[PDB]
Structure 1
Amino acid sequence: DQLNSSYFKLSIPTNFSFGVTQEYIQTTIQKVTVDCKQYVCNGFQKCE
């Protein structure tokens, strides 16, 4: 509660604790290269 006076109320902790916050950042992705000739035509000349 704010005080209507020169003095002001302060809320200050009398106890302390340590806790760990875990964060994950994704800096990389799996790198994939596709062989189009085998995948699209299944090695068939007519498709090519």
Structure 2
Amino acid sequence: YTMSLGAENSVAYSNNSIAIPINFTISVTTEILPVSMTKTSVDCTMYICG
């Protein structure tokens, strides 16, 4: 299929209307970031020549 970017949301803009929240959600989200790699050492003489 042809992918859809997102659901359409037409914001009701007018010159004298505002939308004020009456409630809130305490949302906890996860962010995973790599920090380090496996520390690998290669003996060049032993790798090439044994």
Structure 1: gaps (5+ residues): 44-48
| Structure 2, unpaired ranges of 5+ | 1-12
SS at match of 1:23: strand
- Displacement of 1:35: 2.1
Which structure has greater strand proportion?
A: 2
* TM-score (norm: length of structure 1): 0.55
1:2 alignment counterpart: 14
Deviation (angstroms), 1:10: 0.7
Post-superposition, which runs of at least 4 consecutive aligned residues in structure 1 deviate over 4 A? Answer: none
Count how many residue pairs are aligned between Structure 1 and Structure 2.
Answer: 38
Q: Supply the RMSD in Å over aligned alpha carbons.
A: 1.6
Which residue is equivalent to 2:46? 38
